[PDB]
Amino acid sequence: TSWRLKDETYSYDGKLGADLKEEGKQVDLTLWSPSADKVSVVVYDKNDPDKVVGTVALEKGERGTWKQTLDSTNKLGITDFTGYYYQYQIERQGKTVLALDPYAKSLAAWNSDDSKIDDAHKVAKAAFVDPAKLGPQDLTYGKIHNFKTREDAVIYEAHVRDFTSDPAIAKDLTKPFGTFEAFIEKLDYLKDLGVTHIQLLPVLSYYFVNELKNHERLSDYASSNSNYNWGYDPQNYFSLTGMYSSDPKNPEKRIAEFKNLINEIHKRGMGAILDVVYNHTAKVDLFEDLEPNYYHFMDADGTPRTSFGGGRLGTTHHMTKRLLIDSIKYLVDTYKVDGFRFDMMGDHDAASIEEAYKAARALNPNLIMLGEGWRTYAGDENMPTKAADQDWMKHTDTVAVFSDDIRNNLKSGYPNEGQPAFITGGKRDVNTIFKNLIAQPTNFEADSPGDVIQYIAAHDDLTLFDIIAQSIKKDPSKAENYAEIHRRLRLGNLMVLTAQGTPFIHSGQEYGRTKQFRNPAYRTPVAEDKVPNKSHLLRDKDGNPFDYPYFIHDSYDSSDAVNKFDWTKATDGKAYPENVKSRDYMKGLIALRQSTDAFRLKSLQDIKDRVHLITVPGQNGVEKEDVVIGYQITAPNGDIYAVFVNADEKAREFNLGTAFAHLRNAEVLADENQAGPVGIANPKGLEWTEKGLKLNALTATVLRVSQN
Ligand SMILES: OC[C@H]1NC[C@H](O)[C@@H](O)[C@@H]1O[C@H]1O[C@H](CO)[C@@H](O)[C@H](O)[C@H]1O
Ligand SMILES: [Ca+2]
Ligand code: NA
């Protein structure tokens, strides 16, 4: 057959999944499986999920489906289906497999290290649950402080486990560490930082994990073979993972807890964004077992195409498209979230993503979306389709994309990671730097500044602190290098937080978070076969290893000692003044941005009217490619801001002359120590010169010239 002919003939638009009705008394089951000869539901005990309690056949229905009603008449010995578990038994040409219901609302505790025992253990078992009845009943969409449209968002990227896995805070947690409800206890920190949106790394069920050990601390340094998972191996798109639950064996508990966490985010004036991973599953069979050669993108001969060890969901195909859309709609409606971040959004066709936006916006008119817009489309063989990537930005003002051009130009990025760049001693085309800061990157067309997600660090790759230390080749274990890296960190964060577009902050990017592999047996280089997986070894200018030379660049499979957010470094001004200085700088930066809409203009036409480059490349001691930059915004209220950056290692002068002499009785809103929306009484790192203005080495400033 062909997915195209199968859509023509078995396209189905009714409800899917298991609806727990009648306060537990009844379950209506629907599963799309056109090719099946028989379908039964195997029901597993809620007290012992290994225990099969009975097996009920389903009967054929409309357009390829199979339907059944579990009720009073069951021989199962069940009067309340709540919390019982199920999988689908599907027989085709005499062979039987057990399948996960793709519309499962929750799941039994899952442990992939037991997957080999039998068929029943190869995929998760779904749970009969009713989301609506669970958690805070007053939960609704966020009402987000300081936020009106996408350009207004400040996005903060956190993993649920990392945010509370620091043993250093065990003393202050009343909830089990690294769970949804533990996350709630550190929310006051994020409200004080001033971010509008917390983007959570994938919370939907993922495959490679033993959830039954989720309370064990991963205190040993490791970067491969860890029970920790970022979660980029999807198993189900409606069910939450049990890894962040106080009890993975209670199928309802993760729902209440998540609903309560989204509610707490909301009450603090912030929104939640959900990292979602629709481009690939963890295993080809997750959907191949459901309906052969349909769900995935495929070669011409119907072979499923593959990504990260699993299958590529072909969102061009009717049931796969609706899987994506129903999941989006269900997550927005059930958990009342404020947005989504699409993983490898370029793997998807534009139309799917567009319709996902429209359906999510129909539920929550203030929802935003961004994704990875890399040009990666693979699709069906011989069926080119317009993709939801960077080149799509010129045909839509809906879902924004990450900017690799600013990331690459400022510190490093693929394919030149670790090479000196704007904030790391490597000079850059000044026009290019400026075009990035006004949210016109040079590697794709952004016809609105809200198309652009501006970032210099994320969960992927070396953290901002780590990348800078690698790039300038200075070992942070020397007080003077530590201080220099921070000076550079602040510079970068200033550049992003004052740029047009939507700024994105990796959790910890505010304090100088590191993923240095500080294992006691790894103070110095070790033999080849013991080198930590996903590491880089860091060296100084003479080529001598760093003290603890190995640092992790892909921590998807690393332990708490690698992945924990460091609370002491982030909050203890006495024990770590540089880190806390950095954190306070970010806080002021976000406050600065939020005090005016000069940094967050709403159109391309308005950006070109109001922002003008001051450091013209070539002129006044400013090389065509350099490590300095200066520019001006005329705000909508007529105030005039200027941003000046000196990422050089010597004092450097910015020429003002008569054209920009009005910048002289400016108030200074940021300097080398601090940032904020209010004038710094005694500004440091600035000197007024005859020609214009002198900035100390590794120093940035923001000015505002009022007439008021
Ligand atoms: O989902 C694949 C990748 N998409 C971009 C994300 O930001 C990445 O973190 C993600 O990759 C990570 O997860 C995969 C799948 O488990 C792993 O193989 C990668 O090495 C890891 O970076
Ligand atoms: Ca656009
Ligand atoms: Na890197």
Coordinates of N, CA and C in Angstrom, one line a residue, residues 374-479:
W374 N 17.0 24.6 11.7 CA 18.0 24.1 10.9 C 17.4 23.5 9.7
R375 N 18.2 23.5 8.6 CA 17.7 23.0 7.3 C 18.1 21.5 7.2
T376 N 17.2 20.7 7.7 CA 17.4 19.2 7.9 C 16.3 18.4 7.2
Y377 N 15.4 19.0 6.5 CA 14.2 18.2 6.0 C 14.7 16.9 5.3
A378 N 14.0 15.8 5.6 CA 14.3 14.6 4.9 C 13.0 14.1 4.2
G379 N 11.9 14.0 4.9 CA 10.6 13.7 4.3 C 10.5 12.4 3.6
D380 N 9.4 12.2 2.9 CA 9.2 11.0 2.1 C 10.1 11.1 0.9
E381 N 10.6 10.0 0.4 CA 11.5 9.9 -0.8 C 10.7 10.4 -2.0
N382 N 11.3 11.3 -2.7 CA 10.7 11.8 -3.9 C 9.5 12.7 -3.7
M383 N 9.3 13.2 -2.4 CA 8.2 14.2 -2.2 C 8.7 15.5 -1.5
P384 N 9.6 16.3 -2.1 CA 9.9 17.6 -1.6 C 8.7 18.3 -1.1
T385 N 8.8 19.1 0.0 CA 7.7 19.8 0.7 C 8.4 21.0 1.3
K386 N 7.7 22.1 1.4 CA 8.2 23.3 2.1 C 8.4 23.0 3.6
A387 N 9.6 23.2 4.1 CA 9.9 22.8 5.5 C 9.7 24.0 6.5
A388 N 9.5 23.6 7.8 CA 9.4 24.6 8.9 C 10.8 24.9 9.4
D389 N 11.6 25.5 8.6 CA 13.0 25.9 8.9 C 13.2 27.4 8.8
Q390 N 14.5 27.9 8.9 CA 14.8 29.3 8.8 C 14.3 30.0 7.6
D391 N 14.4 29.3 6.4 CA 14.0 29.8 5.1 C 12.5 30.1 5.1
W392 N 11.7 29.5 6.0 CA 10.3 29.7 6.2 C 9.9 31.0 6.8
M393 N 10.9 31.7 7.5 CA 10.6 32.9 8.3 C 10.0 34.0 7.4
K394 N 10.4 34.1 6.1 CA 9.9 35.1 5.2 C 8.4 34.8 4.7
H395 N 7.8 33.7 5.1 CA 6.4 33.4 4.7 C 5.5 33.4 5.9
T396 N 6.0 33.7 7.1 CA 5.2 33.6 8.3 C 5.7 34.5 9.4
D397 N 4.7 34.9 10.3 CA 5.0 35.7 11.5 C 4.2 34.9 12.6
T398 N 4.7 33.7 12.9 CA 4.0 32.9 13.8 C 5.1 32.3 14.8
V399 N 5.7 31.2 14.3 CA 6.8 30.4 15.1 C 8.2 31.0 14.8
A400 N 8.9 31.4 15.8 CA 10.2 31.9 15.6 C 11.3 30.8 15.6
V401 N 12.5 31.1 15.2 CA 13.6 30.1 15.1 C 14.9 30.6 15.8
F402 N 15.7 29.7 16.3 CA 17.0 30.0 16.9 C 17.9 30.7 15.8
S403 N 18.6 31.7 16.3 CA 19.7 32.3 15.4 C 21.1 31.8 15.6
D404 N 21.5 30.9 14.7 CA 22.9 30.4 14.8 C 24.0 31.5 14.4
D405 N 23.5 32.5 13.6 CA 24.4 33.5 13.1 C 24.9 34.4 14.3
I406 N 24.1 34.7 15.2 CA 24.5 35.6 16.4 C 25.4 34.7 17.3
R407 N 24.9 33.5 17.6 CA 25.6 32.5 18.4 C 27.0 32.3 17.8
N408 N 27.1 32.0 16.5 CA 28.4 31.8 15.8 C 29.2 33.0 15.9
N409 N 28.7 34.2 15.5 CA 29.4 35.4 15.5 C 29.9 35.9 16.8
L410 N 29.2 35.7 17.9 CA 29.6 36.2 19.3 C 30.6 35.3 20.0
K411 N 30.3 34.1 20.2 CA 31.1 33.1 20.8 C 31.2 32.0 19.8
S412 N 31.5 30.7 20.0 CA 31.5 30.0 18.7 C 30.2 29.3 18.4
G413 N 30.2 28.5 17.3 CA 29.1 27.6 17.0 C 29.5 26.6 15.9
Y414 N 28.7 25.6 15.7 CA 28.9 24.6 14.6 C 29.1 25.4 13.3
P415 N 30.1 25.0 12.4 CA 31.0 23.9 12.6 C 32.4 24.3 13.2
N416 N 32.5 25.5 13.7 CA 33.8 26.0 14.2 C 33.9 26.2 15.8
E417 N 33.2 25.4 16.5 CA 33.1 25.5 18.0 C 34.5 25.7 18.6
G418 N 34.6 26.6 19.5 CA 35.9 26.9 20.2 C 36.8 27.9 19.5
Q419 N 36.5 28.3 18.2 CA 37.3 29.3 17.5 C 37.0 30.7 18.1
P420 N 38.0 31.5 18.3 CA 37.8 32.9 18.8 C 36.7 33.6 18.0
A421 N 35.8 34.4 18.7 CA 34.8 35.1 18.0 C 34.6 36.4 18.8
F422 N 33.5 37.1 18.5 CA 33.3 38.5 18.9 C 33.6 38.8 20.4
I423 N 33.1 37.9 21.3 CA 33.3 38.1 22.7 C 34.5 37.3 23.2
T424 N 35.2 36.6 22.3 CA 36.3 35.7 22.7 C 37.6 35.9 22.0
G425 N 37.8 37.2 21.6 CA 39.1 37.6 21.1 C 39.3 37.4 19.6
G426 N 38.2 37.1 18.9 CA 38.3 36.8 17.5 C 37.4 37.9 16.8
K427 N 38.1 38.7 16.0 CA 37.4 39.9 15.4 C 36.4 39.6 14.4
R428 N 35.3 40.3 14.3 CA 34.2 40.0 13.3 C 33.7 41.2 12.6
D429 N 33.2 41.0 11.4 CA 32.6 42.0 10.5 C 31.6 42.8 11.3
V430 N 31.8 44.1 11.4 CA 31.1 44.9 12.3 C 29.6 45.1 11.8
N431 N 29.5 45.3 10.5 CA 28.2 45.2 9.9 C 27.4 44.0 10.2
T432 N 28.0 42.8 10.2 CA 27.4 41.5 10.5 C 27.0 41.4 12.0
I433 N 27.8 41.9 12.9 CA 27.5 42.0 14.3 C 26.3 42.8 14.5
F434 N 26.3 44.0 13.9 CA 25.1 45.0 14.0 C 23.8 44.4 13.4
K435 N 23.9 43.8 12.2 CA 22.7 43.2 11.6 C 22.2 42.1 12.5
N436 N 23.0 41.4 13.1 CA 22.5 40.4 14.1 C 21.8 41.1 15.3
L437 N 22.4 42.1 15.8 CA 21.8 42.8 17.0 C 20.5 43.4 16.7
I438 N 20.2 43.7 15.5 CA 18.9 44.3 15.1 C 18.0 43.2 14.5
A439 N 18.3 42.0 14.8 CA 17.5 40.8 14.4 C 17.3 40.7 12.9
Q440 N 18.4 41.0 12.2 CA 18.5 40.6 10.8 C 19.7 39.8 10.5
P441 N 19.7 38.5 10.9 CA 20.8 37.6 10.7 C 21.1 37.4 9.1
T442 N 22.3 37.1 8.8 CA 22.8 37.1 7.5 C 22.6 35.7 6.8
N443 N 22.2 34.7 7.5 CA 22.1 33.3 6.9 C 20.7 32.9 6.6
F444 N 19.8 33.8 7.0 CA 18.4 33.7 6.5 C 17.6 35.1 6.6
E445 N 16.6 35.2 5.9 CA 15.7 36.4 5.9 C 14.7 36.5 7.0
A446 N 14.9 37.3 8.0 CA 13.9 37.7 9.0 C 13.2 39.0 8.7
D447 N 12.0 38.9 8.1 CA 11.2 40.1 7.8 C 10.4 40.6 9.0
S448 N 10.6 40.1 10.2 CA 10.0 40.7 11.4 C 11.0 40.3 12.6
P449 N 11.3 41.2 13.5 CA 12.3 40.8 14.5 C 11.8 39.7 15.5
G450 N 10.5 39.5 15.6 CA 10.0 38.4 16.3 C 10.2 37.0 15.7
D451 N 10.6 36.9 14.4 CA 11.0 35.7 13.8 C 12.3 35.1 14.4
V452 N 13.1 35.9 15.1 CA 14.4 35.6 15.6 C 14.5 35.3 17.1
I453 N 14.9 34.1 17.4 CA 15.3 33.8 18.8 C 16.8 34.0 19.0
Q454 N 17.1 35.0 19.8 CA 18.5 35.4 19.9 C 19.1 34.6 21.1
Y455 N 20.2 33.9 20.8 CA 20.9 33.2 21.9 C 22.4 33.0 21.6
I456 N 23.1 32.7 22.7 CA 24.6 32.4 22.6 C 24.9 31.1 23.4
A457 N 23.9 30.6 24.1 CA 24.1 29.3 24.8 C 22.8 28.7 25.0
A458 N 22.8 27.3 25.2 CA 21.6 26.5 25.4 C 22.0 25.2 26.1
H459 N 21.1 24.3 26.2 CA 21.5 23.0 26.9 C 22.5 22.2 26.1
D460 N 22.4 22.3 24.8 CA 23.4 21.7 23.9 C 24.7 22.5 23.9
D461 N 25.8 21.7 23.7 CA 27.1 22.3 23.5 C 27.7 22.8 24.9
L462 N 28.8 23.4 24.9 CA 29.4 23.9 26.1 C 28.6 25.1 26.6
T463 N 28.4 25.1 27.9 CA 27.8 26.3 28.5 C 28.6 27.6 28.1
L464 N 28.0 28.8 28.3 CA 28.7 30.0 28.0 C 30.0 30.3 28.7
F465 N 30.0 30.0 30.0 CA 31.3 30.0 30.7 C 32.3 29.1 30.2
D466 N 31.9 27.8 29.9 CA 32.8 26.8 29.4 C 33.3 27.2 28.0
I467 N 32.5 27.6 27.1 CA 32.9 27.9 25.7 C 33.9 29.1 25.7
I468 N 33.6 30.1 26.6 CA 34.5 31.3 26.6 C 35.9 30.8 27.1
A469 N 35.9 30.0 28.2 CA 37.2 29.5 28.7 C 38.0 28.7 27.6
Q470 N 37.3 27.8 26.9 CA 37.9 27.1 25.8 C 38.4 28.1 24.7
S471 N 37.6 29.1 24.4 CA 37.9 30.0 23.3 C 39.1 31.0 23.5
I472 N 39.2 31.6 24.6 CA 40.3 32.4 25.0 C 41.5 31.6 25.6
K473 N 41.2 30.3 25.8 CA 42.3 29.4 26.3 C 42.9 29.8 27.7
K474 N 42.0 30.2 28.6 CA 42.5 30.7 30.0 C 41.8 29.8 31.1
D475 N 42.7 29.1 31.8 CA 42.2 28.2 32.9 C 41.5 29.0 34.0
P476 N 40.2 28.7 34.2 CA 39.4 29.5 35.2 C 39.8 29.3 36.6
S477 N 40.7 28.3 36.9 CA 41.1 28.0 38.2 C 42.1 29.1 38.7
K478 N 42.4 30.1 37.9 CA 43.2 31.2 38.3 C 42.3 32.4 38.5
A479 N 42.3 32.9 39.7 CA 41.4 34.0 40.0 C 41.2 35.0 38.9

